[PDB]
A paper describes a structure:
Apicoplast replication, however, is carried out by a single DNA polymerase called apPol. Apicoplast DNA undergoes reactive oxygen species-mediated oxidative damage, and since apPol is the only polymerase in the apicoplast, this enzyme is anticipated to perform both replicative and lesion bypass DNA synthesis. ApPol belongs to the A-family of DNA polymerases but is only distantly related to the well-studied A-family polymerases, including bacterial DNA polymerase I (Pol I), T7 DNA polymerase, and mitochondrial DNA polymerase gamma. We have used electron cryomicroscopy (cryoEM) to solve a series of structures of apPol in complex with an undamaged primer/template DNA and the correct incoming dNTP.
The apPol density was well-resolved, and we could trace the entire polypeptide backbone and identify densities for several amino acid residues. Overall, the apPol structure was similar to the previously reported structure of the apo enzyme. The DNA density was fragmented and there was no clear density for the incoming nucleotide. We further classified the particles contributing to the consensus map and could resolve them into four structures (global resolution ranging from 3.8 Å to 4.1 Å) corresponding to apPol–DNA, apPol–dGTP, and two conformational states of apPol–DNA–dGTP complexes.
Author numbering: 1 to 626
Write the structure that this text describes.
Amino acid sequence: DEITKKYIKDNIINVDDNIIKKKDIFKLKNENNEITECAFEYFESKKKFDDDIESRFFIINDNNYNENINLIYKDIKYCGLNIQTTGLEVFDENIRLIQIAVENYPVIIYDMFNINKKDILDGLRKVLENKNIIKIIQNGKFDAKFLLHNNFKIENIFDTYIASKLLDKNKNMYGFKLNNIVEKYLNVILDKQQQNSVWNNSLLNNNQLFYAARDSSCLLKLYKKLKEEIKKENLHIVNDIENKCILPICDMELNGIKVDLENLQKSTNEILNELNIEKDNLKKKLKDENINVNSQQQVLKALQKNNVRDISNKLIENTSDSNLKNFLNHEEIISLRNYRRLYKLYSAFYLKLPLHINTKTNKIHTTFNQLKTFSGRFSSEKPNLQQIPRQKNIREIFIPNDNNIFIIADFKQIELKIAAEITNDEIMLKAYNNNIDLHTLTASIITKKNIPDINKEDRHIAKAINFGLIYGMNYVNLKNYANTYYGLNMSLDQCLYFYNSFFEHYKGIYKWHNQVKQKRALQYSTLSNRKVIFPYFSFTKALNYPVQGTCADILKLALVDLYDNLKDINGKIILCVHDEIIIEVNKKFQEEALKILVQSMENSASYFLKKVKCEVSVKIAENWGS
DNA sequence: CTAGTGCTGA
DNA sequence: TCAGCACTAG
């Protein structure tokens, strides 16, 4: 039909009319700073949209290309960037459209599947690569991944999703989509009713492209309002750190971590054989061949039948971990706990990892979020690399690529040092400046011994108590935390003495607790001014948000600096979990990468914390579990 | 024979 | 998060 092929030469198919090809004379400055009149071709919606957002759009392909269109990019400061892709997986999908939105101009849509002259993208590469031009994106991680994977270099970025998330102060988890944000801040409905229309086809319908253009032009007005809103709330530091942390995260996701298939198979066979042996032993002990070991009620009934009792001659009724500890003087329950451990490992990690390794490259690629967590720390999904077992044997599976070497660096006592800085405790700072660990100090003041005499067990009691009480746990509740997560058995009188002694000397933390509990404020802030508003008062969250948020800020600034400092030796950032950062470098640059990483982490720590000097433990490792 | 909720730990 | 196990419905 002639109506549907009116603009087929530009790879546009007309569905419901509502499209007109119009030519107008534009005014632009030549490279020599001379106003040169140029005539372009742009498409417009025949039926005007009720909103004020821009809807005109160019389309640049192999034939329609005009050399003077690059004059739009000259002497700009912000540009709206949005890309449409054939699918979500970066490795199995290509980029369909690149969209650049420039103020008081139509959006420029690059038809990637119909571009073959590499000079067509010459100006796009410069406008993306320039550090003085701010690129506005929605969910910038996705677009940055897709652009970097396709040999585009992107340097500056301003994610409207990040600004919207920070401004809401973690009040709501859902929302924060382009329609929601634009409705909230501009009072305009984008009509995002496109149900993920077909993009793989070379021809694209009218409504698809007009939805694409309005999703890009609206980012300029959102930038204008959100910049002022961030400046008003003094969130510019956190916003800048987060925006610059997009590229490190995308680099981590693209690089991934390699998996040794041979060692993985060997470990899987060994663990499965051990599981079978333990299952047979438990079957013999439970005296029920048909019993399903995994069934909770069945094992409860079996143990009840066998009549394993307490020291108080009390029978078990729940197989929770805390309950199982009380009953340990029988072989049956020991075998049951061992089997539970083995089964948890086998069914959580070994059998689940092969679903995540890509056979095309033999690597695990993770999805890193940076604002879903309440504290602000990174969170990983699909393969939850934070949920990997911490045992040395398990982590030995992960290895660097061929002809490379890992460099693992992690902070020491970062939460405690941040707490000392924020609360301004007189004694903690003076201790740290003399090179004594706060765990050692806590152990010494508890045990009344001098610093040299502290053993490892006292250090362990200190490790429990310091993390226990800094976040406001009551002395009664210290028992459960100590026994559950460290195995120490403590008498409540001993806990009372520990609490009194701990808060008698560290005056700063006591004053901090008193102020936070007296004020009962609903708004809290970190040292990067990342603000959060809780629905109601929560003492533990109140005392925990500042330190952990500042730790997240320190790690993010470290990644931002490290990504720039590693470009000389082609280092690859692989992972960032807890207070740990992993980078792979070639074996020739083994020595320099260590100094680069140490300097980056130390500068990041010293930017925020000023009283205390942070130290980093770095080791050159052949594999993760070294 | 397939669907689910509802409930219990690792 | 993640897995798995008794109890309603055709």
